[PDB]
Scaffold this motif. Structure first.
Motif, PDB file in Angstrom:
ATOM      1  N   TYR A  79       0.914  -1.158   0.000  1.00 17.53           N
ATOM      2  CA  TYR A  79       0.000   0.000   0.000  1.00 17.53           C
ATOM      3  C   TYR A  79       0.948   1.202   0.000  1.00 17.53           C
ATOM      4  O   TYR A  79       1.390   1.697   1.032  1.00 17.53           O
ATOM      5  CB  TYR A  79      -0.827  -0.015   1.262  1.00 17.53           C
ATOM      6  N   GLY A 123      -4.656  -2.359   4.045  1.00 21.50           N
ATOM      7  CA  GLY A 123      -4.345  -1.673   5.291  1.00 21.50           C
ATOM      8  C   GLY A 123      -3.079  -2.132   5.958  1.00 21.50           C
ATOM      9  O   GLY A 123      -2.107  -2.142   5.228  1.00 21.50           O
ATOM     10  N   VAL A 556      -8.715   5.704  13.417  1.00 23.41           N
ATOM     11  CA  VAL A 556      -8.786   5.412  11.980  1.00 23.41           C
ATOM     12  C   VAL A 556      -8.103   4.060  11.693  1.00 23.41           C
ATOM     13  O   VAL A 556      -6.938   3.918  12.072  1.00 23.41           O
ATOM     14  CB  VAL A 556      -8.135   6.557  11.205  1.00 23.41           C
ATOM     15  N   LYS A 557      -8.789   3.063  11.095  1.00 24.84           N
ATOM     16  CA  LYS A 557      -8.281   1.706  10.839  1.00 24.84           C
ATOM     17  C   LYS A 557      -9.454   0.869  10.304  1.00 24.84           C
ATOM     18  O   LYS A 557     -10.573   1.364  10.424  1.00 24.84           O
ATOM     19  CB  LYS A 557      -7.779   1.030  12.117  1.00 24.84           C
ATOM     20  N   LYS A 563     -11.385  -4.711  16.659  1.00 19.04           N
ATOM     21  CA  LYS A 563     -10.755  -3.395  16.788  1.00 19.04           C
ATOM     22  C   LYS A 563     -11.595  -2.455  17.647  1.00 19.04           C
ATOM     23  O   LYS A 563     -11.145  -1.387  18.082  1.00 19.04           O
ATOM     24  CB  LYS A 563     -10.537  -2.846  15.379  1.00 19.04           C
ATOM     25  N   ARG A 638      -7.585   6.169   3.690  1.00 19.57           N
ATOM     26  CA  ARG A 638      -6.550   5.600   2.847  1.00 19.57           C
ATOM     27  C   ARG A 638      -5.227   6.180   3.296  1.00 19.57           C
ATOM     28  O   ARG A 638      -5.292   7.108   4.106  1.00 19.57           O
ATOM     29  CB  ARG A 638      -6.859   6.020   1.420  1.00 19.57           C
ATOM     30  N   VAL A 639      -4.069   5.775   2.754  1.00 20.13           N
ATOM     31  CA  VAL A 639      -2.777   6.323   3.142  1.00 20.13           C
ATOM     32  C   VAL A 639      -2.821   7.828   3.051  1.00 20.13           C
ATOM     33  O   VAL A 639      -2.628   8.414   4.104  1.00 20.13           O
ATOM     34  CB  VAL A 639      -1.613   5.816   2.270  1.00 20.13           C
ATOM     35  N   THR A 665       0.202  -0.681  13.559  1.00 16.68           N
ATOM     36  CA  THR A 665       1.253   0.177  13.015  1.00 16.68           C
ATOM     37  C   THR A 665       0.633   1.578  13.054  1.00 16.68           C
ATOM     38  O   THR A 665       1.360   2.555  13.328  1.00 16.68           O
ATOM     39  CB  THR A 665       1.631  -0.248  11.582  1.00 16.68           C
ATOM     40  N   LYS A 669       2.277   5.360  14.334  1.00 16.03           N
ATOM     41  CA  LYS A 669       2.323   6.573  13.546  1.00 16.03           C
ATOM     42  C   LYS A 669       1.864   7.763  14.378  1.00 16.03           C
ATOM     43  O   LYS A 669       2.380   8.875  14.220  1.00 16.03           O
ATOM     44  CB  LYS A 669       1.449   6.393  12.313  1.00 16.03           C
TER      45      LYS A 669
END
Ligand SMILES: *Cc1c(COP(=O)(O)O)cnc(C)c1O
Ligand SMILES: *Cc1c(COP(=O)(O)O)cnc(C)c1O
Ligand SMILES: OC[C@@H]1[C@@H](O)[C@H](O)[C@@H](O)c2nnnn21
Ligand SMILES: OC[C@@H]1[C@@H](O)[C@H](O)[C@@H](O)c2nnnn21
Lengths: 831, 831
Positions: A79, A123, A556-557, A563, A638-639, A665, A669
């Motif tokens: 990604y 993801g 956000v995920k 989750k 999205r990224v 991950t 960040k």
């Protein structure tokens, strides 16, 4: 000066402008009078790509001259995100292109927002791959990421009535300036067919052929002049049996039917991990495995062998020249396929081929939740791939003979650790094939790796304990710090320098400014600016004026039950019920931002998305709440939206039932960019708290011992419903239709799930969570104390650099030494 | 000096080399150490394309400034061939690129053979379009050729056991350096749906949408700096209803199903003309018509109107600013579609819209044989296109009311000239819709145009005689003389200059060297060199050593019964039977070369190809025949093989039953290059003989009066079988298996056809043909007399220049004046 975002040299801004205009005219076939922002974006994209072909070419020739061991990272996902700014950053080109385009009257930041995201990922898995490739190039490694060039990436999410609507991601409509189609290296992939046994060898004969055309994308290391390659395969019909076996059909239709062999790289399967037994999936899997292994052997046959010394094609030296990393079980077929090419075509003894295969292959496990495990129907591998299911049976047979020799009489062990699961549908356990055939197996965080040794791969560990390892995930400092947060990278840079971008451990030197009023005002100044830009952008390109003075609370995920976005919703409704109860009481104001995509068939995830927009409906139009609370669903995460939200967040939600998130991950960040974490002791949250001290985290809830203890006695949500009146209130507000007034019955499935079939125990972490949330609002009220807990997070992020992860992979699994020393920059020469 | 194939300037060879190396490195991402011929071809292709973007851009801006009337040539076929050498030639760049690449150590001629042919055509139709576009640019006309960008061109022919085997033409595997994808101008094409009548207008509602993405290819005029545009549409799925109407399906499959809307430009329909009633065909037809008309109106709304003077969107001036040429009935839907856009969306009166539509539209008829006429099922246009079948009914209704007013009481006229054919399947006669709705109808040769006025469109002529015209086909001197035959273009150039390439009528000045021994030795020297190269190439890249001292007898064109390749076969077998009869008698030696492709479903054409290879089998291995006779089937005849065979031929076969070949264009290519013609009085053969005198042709056989007289009494082949013992011998050699020994029965279908159902009267032209063939062998024996009949052919080719054809179209149909004066060459400026 802007930042120290590279130099903006006098000659260098001149050459860039000249080159920008040469591509607008010659490459775009536009003149500045008819050119849109888009055409300007592509003229900059091509001028920046020009600056890395010289290096790409010199880097590859270099790997051929000194013949290092090469690492092939096989992932069905990469990604990548947008690549213009990452390329300018890793080449030191960003304030030169910024001066240059400004002098052409162009806002470079407009042009960067034009680029489609390469969303060839779902993801955490594809992004880990993207982040590893940036680190491998930065650590000077001869490495190639090997994936499928999907025509359609992950779908674009549309929230249409509070419901997710999927849309095809046609990321190539306008072309991609970054790849170089390499038609010249098309390779054949064989499918179907049969095995006939000559009493000399086995031949797989009668197969349908699909062609695999490579497309290379350059991966530039940070300012070390290494440019490595990401090779992505595209499926092509042979324009021969498709028109060689006729025998009725019709010419037109034989030509239409080619988009049927080309369908193998048409689309990314949208399963933010869960497993779907579809033939197209096994085919995409076999496609990237067979094509790539032909490229590996090709590059091995040449070198300092297809040239000289002990003159037989010495496959004995294969593991010392080759390492392939299986990123999950998606490429597991690289194990019977390397046995096929070795035994069937190179004619090595079975036992010698097996020594070479396990010494080459290594496996990374990315999750323990069982719905994500690939267990393929045997009637499927028998039809589609019959030599491989035969080789796989042979592996299984010789494996159990060594298990049985080590644990004599343990008949259950044998049933348990078999690669062939008997049952309703006989199946092959791909995870088991990967542990049998790899010399290293690994988890992505210390808690996950332990859980693998203690539950799921316990028997395999007892046999071969030497294989299991841990490589805790990481994030690259470049995109996830220098790129998305130039401001934060600048004030750190001012105090401690710029060398921290090749070893984030130097961020430890920041601990010394925790008590420095200039630095505390600076860390909080940039977080307030970032929050002003994301507040702006949101109105501008999406919706409502959010308060930049709120605590930006963001989760956000991907939407999954593990989750636990419904746990975050229960907290939001709790907050709204306390305001309504006592309306004229001060609360710390929040803007809760929840976002992520739901796999198309996961009805509960789709129901959860409708809940969150239904809570936004209520809360955001309550006049009594005023402005103290807003609920926002970030559409199409999205990224590139991650590079926008994550620098603007104050609170990171990492709320998974303990034991379910293997690492995460996203959590890392957010620690790099000055947000504090509220999270369970799960995944890498454990190592994050440990790195900054528990006192600098808002760790809470059940631990993994507590989920097991609860599961042994039996989890019953009703009990929590009784003891907690605020949880009663919410549940009945869901059941009666407070949040869905035209359809009272609408959230009945969620109530029922929570109440009767919650595999992830949302209700058991509710009191500890909503109390832990009172402590973060408490700290927020003391600005100076928030910003210094923040400085102790940022300062302690070094372990979470994918550069650490990769120097660990290189050294403990691949047998390679990471260098970070500049290779020569080409300057003139075209060879 | 090489030729005067442009200058090879000192600075200009320098800049080319520099640019060649800049694209090998930067564009190919190769270095000279890893680059194949292919990569070298693409580095030259991009350096040559660089030299025409400046002109392309200046030519288009120019047409916007001075706003000329624009000509849109709508053709479902453009058979372009390879474009590198044509671009170098029309820019004066060929000995510069030839010096330049030689100095890089490259044989430019190797690199040119690398290029795929754009075979987006079947044959005479697509190539006429290709040849017209080169002339329109050369005559300075604001013209745009508008076609479909097929993914798969005309299939590649493989002769596998004497049988044609079709193979998909993937001409884009390696990319195309010549186009510029223009995603920015994607347009919507509506299909299916329904019509609801508001009492204000009709709306076509509920349609499926397909997107049309343009791709432009530059068309450079000969040394006048005009570069016009060929826009080819590509089909794209909307990435919206495809994922907007869900309502069960499955996400993956909604994304797979897009290659189903993209199928509309997947493949060229292989019917070297005959008509197939397939829905995909009507869809390709409607696709290029709707997308193009949106571009026409777009460019009309802007100009000196979308700017100023008599302020309503003045469609009255549409015919004075727009001309669309319907190249056959394939784009006939441009007539109810321009009525739709005008009446439905622009809201003009029906009668006013009709005046504008006929004043814009013109129709070219390309054949009279009835199996080639498009007659579409009404249930098909009703389903797929319901507003257009309604508009078409309205046209038909008002047309017959004017026919009935002119020929009162003629009830049969009305049945006859209706656009709606009643019958078993009610149908729409597209030819009739094109004569009703065009202001000019035209044939492609004087005999064909007359036959249209006298038989097929007789009633339409009696109504509107003013519409019918003739525009005799032409060929471009550039590719078909300067490009394929530099040698011949050079010795003409030596004597009379180079101005003959913009007016081939100056070839008339060559008549003065008919008696000039230097020129007779030169014309025969280059024909002997060309024959040495084609003899070489044939061994080298295909097969057997043919005698360059033979008469090269060639018939290259699509395999059809009307073109009568079986008549040429009867002559070859006759020759072989005379040698065998009298083995030690001198005959003039021949190499008979027959080649062309057969549409996949035309079983007789496929049987004819097997005959010719079966005759090659026998004749070429008869020791007694030795070398005096060889039969060769030229595999995969296409434009680039035509540039090889046609300069090497001595005899051109143009042997169609009189009245069936509307014009021919192969025949003209052979007259320009020094081959004499043996042919019937058919098509343009009539005007060719007339141009050079009958005495310089080997005209023969029945004339059209004679085919009618024969048809009225009744054609009976048995009668010829009785009177001609050499025709008896051949027929029985076919029936018994002399030419098919393992399968005696194999040619039984051809015998039977000749004997019992020959619609094209092969046997009736046999004696006149085989006698006329004795006269050409007779002349061949007298070298000096062959070469001077040849000089009288070459000298008289001027009428057959597509530049004459196009200055006739411009002036008598489009109302445009041809200029040929150099536009300014850009030199520096990027605007
Ligand atoms: C980093 C990233 C992820 C990973 O998120 P987790 O919270 O670890 O599950 C997912 N999607 C995108 C867009 C990412 O940038
Ligand atoms: C010119 C040309 C034709 C036209 O041939 P006719 O003999 O006129 O039917 C067909 N195919 C190709 C390749 C051509 O170059
Ligand atoms: O290891 C990368 C990421 C982990 O961080 C996630 O915890 C896990 O759910 C996952 N599944 N596939 N890929 N991943
Ligand atoms: O006009 C161009 C050519 C003619 O030369 C041929 O005689 C005719 O058969 C034809 N059919 N379609 N296109 N063409």
């Amino acid at each position: 000066q802007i930042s120290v975002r590279g130099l903006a040299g006098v000659e260098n801004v001149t050459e860039l402008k000249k080159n920008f205009n040469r591509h607008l005219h010659f490459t775009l076939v536009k003149d500045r009078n008819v050119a849109t922002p888009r055409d300007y974006y592509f003229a900059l994209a091509h001028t920046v790509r020009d600056h890395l072909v010289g290096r790409w070419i010199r880097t590859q020739q270099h790997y051929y001259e000194k013949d290092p061991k090469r690492i092939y990272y096989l992932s069905l996902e990469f990604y990548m995100g947008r690549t213009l700014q990452n390329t300018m950053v890793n080449l030191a080109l960003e304030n030169a292109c910024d001066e240059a385009t400004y002098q052409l009257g162009l806002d470079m930041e407009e042009l960067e927002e034009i680029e489609e995201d390469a969303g060839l990922g779902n993801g955490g898995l594809g992004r880990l791959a993207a982040c590893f490739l940036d680190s491998m190039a930065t650590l000077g490694l001869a490495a190639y990421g090997y994936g499928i060039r999907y025509e359609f990436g992950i779908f674009n999410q549309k929230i249409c009535g509070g419901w997710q609507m999927e849309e095809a991601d046609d990321w190539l409509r306008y072309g991609n300036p970054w790849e170089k189609a390499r038609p010249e290296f098309t390779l054949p992939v064989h499918f179907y067919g049969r095995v006939e046994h000559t009493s000399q060898g086995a031949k797989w004969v009668d197969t349908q052929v699909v062609l695999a055309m490579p497309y290379d994308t350059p991966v530039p290391g940070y300012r070390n002049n290494v440019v490595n390659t990401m090779r992505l395969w595209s499926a092509k019909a042979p324009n021969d049996f498709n028109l060689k076996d006729f025998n009725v059909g019709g010419y037109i239709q034989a030509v239409l039917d080619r988009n049927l062999a080309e369908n193998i790289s048409r689309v990314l399967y949208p399963n933010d991990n869960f497993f779907e037994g579809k033939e197209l999936r096994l085919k995409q899997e076999y496609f990237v495995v067979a094509a790539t292994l032909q490229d590996i052997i090709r590059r091995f046959k040449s070198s300092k062998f297809g040239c000289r010394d002990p003159v037989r094609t010495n496959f004995d030296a294969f593991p010392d020249k080759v390492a392939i990393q299986l990123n999950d079980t998606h490429p597991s077929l690289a194990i019977p396929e390397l046995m096929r090419v070795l035994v069937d075509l190179e004619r090595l003894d079975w036992d010698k081929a097996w020594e070479v295969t396990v010494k080459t292959c290594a496996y990374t496990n990315h999750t323990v939740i069982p719905e994500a495990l690939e267990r393929w129907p045997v009637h499927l591998l028998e039809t589609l791939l019959p030599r491989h299911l035969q080789i796989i049976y042979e592996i299984n047979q010789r494996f159990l003979n060594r298990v049985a020799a080590a644990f004599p009489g343990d008949v259950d062990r044998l049933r348990r650790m078999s690669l062939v699961e008997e049952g309703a549908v006989k199946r092959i356990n791909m995870a088991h094939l990967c542990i049998a055939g790899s010399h290293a197996v690994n988890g992505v965080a210390r808690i996950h790796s332990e859980i693998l040794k203690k539950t799921i791969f316990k028997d395999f560990y007892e046999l071969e304990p030497h294989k299991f390892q841990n490589k805790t995930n990481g994030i690259t400092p470049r995109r996830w710090l220098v790129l998305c947060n130039p401001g934060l990278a600048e004030i750190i840079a001012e105090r401690i320098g710029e060398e921290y971008i090749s070893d984030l451990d130097q961020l430890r030197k920041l601990l010394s400014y925790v008590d420095d009023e200039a630095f505390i005002r600076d860390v909080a100044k940039v977080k307030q600016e970032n929050k002003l830009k994301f507040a702006a952008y949101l109105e501008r390109e999406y919706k409502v004026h959010i308060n930049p003075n709120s605590l930006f609370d963001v989760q956000v995920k991907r939407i999954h039950e593990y989750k636990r976005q419904l746990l975050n919703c229960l907290h939001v409704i709790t907050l709204y019920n306390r305001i309504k109860k006592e309306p004229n009481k001060f609360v710390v104001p929040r803007t809760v931002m929840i976002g992520g995509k739901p796999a198309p068939g996961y009805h509960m995830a789709k129901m959860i998305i409708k809940l969150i927009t239904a809570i936004g409906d209520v809360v955001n139009h309550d006049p009594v709440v005023g402005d103290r609370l807003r609920v926002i669903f970030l559409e199409n995460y999205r990224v590139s939206l991650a590079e926008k939200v994550i620098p603007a967040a104050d609170l990171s939600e990492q709320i998974s039932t303990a034991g379910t998130e293997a690492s995460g991950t996203g959590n890392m960040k957010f620690m790099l960019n000055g947000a504090l974490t509220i999270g369970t002791m799960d995944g890498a949250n454990v190592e994050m708290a440990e790195e900054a001290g528990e006192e600098n985290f808002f760790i809470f809830g059940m631990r993994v011992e507590d989920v097991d203890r609860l599961d042994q006695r039996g989890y019953n949500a009703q009990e929590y419903y009784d003891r907690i009146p605020e949880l009663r209130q919410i549940i009945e507000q869901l059941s009666s239709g407070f949040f869905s007034p035209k359809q009272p019955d609408l959230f009945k499935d969620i109530v029922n799930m929570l109440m009767h079939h919650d595999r992830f125990k949302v209700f058991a972490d509710y009191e500890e969570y909503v109390k832990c949330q009172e402590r973060v609002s408490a700290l927020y009220k003391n600005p100076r104390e928030w910003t210094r807990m923040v400085i102790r997070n940022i300062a302690t992020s070094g372990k979470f650099s994918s550069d650490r992860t990769i120097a660990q992979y290189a050294r403990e699994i691949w047998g390679v030494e990471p260098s970070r020393q500049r290779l020569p920059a080409p300057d003139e020469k075209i060879p």
